[PDB]
């Protein structure tokens, strides 16, 4: 059992919405230190890792640790009722359901039944930190133009393209551009990743959010952004499988 309160219902709704694009159900481990969730999509191409320390919640009371399983589509449907400034209260008692209350100027309560849900380390040579706007633009620009997007990183340049034979769209960044905050490269690095996976990964990403991307030559990419400074959502995406 526990009682957890998060200020900013919409933001929490965005995290769940994002995860639901990769998986239908997930297991959330709720301990005194915080909430964690790890999962791999059905295609075994992307791994999602979510960690929300108790420090980011305005109220965090856990009577007894527990791992609860939930259908993310059902959860998202309820959470989308929350406004940017609404407060979200999650309460779990002895029974198999989570009581969700959303309060702003008025209050609303819902139930989400629980379900039984069963089921990074690479030698990266490039690291970049960009504003979410750049990645959101990149995927929106690539969607129906190509199957994948080629990521290229050099000393003072980050490029997202797809060297091929179709109409070509490329986003280029240098440190002089506001979209690129940091770039560290050990050697020229290139890899390509699936466009539909990236579109899902950047779903609900804020345009002003700072996103760290780490990758290598023909290797997976690790994408990560923070939630309330201490929380974090991390993705590990295969370059090909």
Swiss-Prot record:
GO terms for MF: DNA binding; DNA polymerase processivity factor activity
Protein name: DNA polymerase sliding clamp
A Pfam family assignment: PCNA_C
Complex formation: Homotrimer which circularizes head-to-tail (head is a N-terminus, tail is at C-terminus) to form a toroid. RFC opens the toroid so it can load on DNA. Interacts with both Pol I (pol) and Pol II (polB-polC), with Hel308 (hjm) and with Hjc. Interaction with the C-terminal PIP-box of RfcL may stabilize the toroidal structure.
Biological process terms in GO annotation: leading strand elongation; regulation of DNA replication
Keywords: DNA replication, DNA-binding
Protein purpose: Sliding clamp subunit that acts as a moving platform for DNA processing. Responsible for tethering the catalytic subunit of DNA polymerase to DNA during high-speed replication. Unlike its eukaryotic paralog, loads on circular DNA without the replication factor C (RFC) clamp loader, although RFC greatly increases loading efficiency. Stimulates the ATPase activity of replication factor C (RFC) in the presence of ssDNA. Stimulates the helicase activity of Hel308 and may alter its substrate specificity.
Similarity comment text for this entry: Belongs to the PCNA family.
Keyword Metal-binding recorded: no
Keyword tRNA processing on entry: no
